Amino acid sequence: KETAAAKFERQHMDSSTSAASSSNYCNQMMKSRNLTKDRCKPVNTFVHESLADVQAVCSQKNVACKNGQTNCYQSYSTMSATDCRETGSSKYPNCAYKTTQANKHIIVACEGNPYVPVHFDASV
Ligand SMILES: [Cl-]
Ligand SMILES: [Cl-]
């Protein structure tokens, strides 16, 4: 089984680019990160910052999680991120995604020791 920390890294980290290079970015990333294996994951965000900068958010602004839990943190700075969302043409096994790039504050839920991101709550 994949640990929570490793799943967060695989689903949400892309430190190899400064931002989504093209409209096909999400089709490529959702496939390469194995998020379209048995079903098309509908919505997914990739953060384009170093793994260290994203983990550091767990010691930044403590904000409530949409579920009411208290282990969410919002990044003090905006970070380059790409939101991937299925298009209406998507159906599987031929997943299709719209790529929307921006710079926003990220909110993550953290846990463990070390205290690292395990869920991506939203942008902002
Ligand atoms: Cl791994
Ligand atoms: Cl997401």
Side-chain angles (χ1 to χ4, degrees), residues 1-13 71 109-112 114 116-120:
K1 177 179 171 301
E2 194 181 23
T3 65
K7 178 163 194 187
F8 172 94
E9 288 162 355
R10 176 178 60 84
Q11 295 195 307
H12 309 296
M13 297 300 305
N71 63 334
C110 305
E111 66 181 38
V116 296
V118 292
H119 293 298
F120 190 89

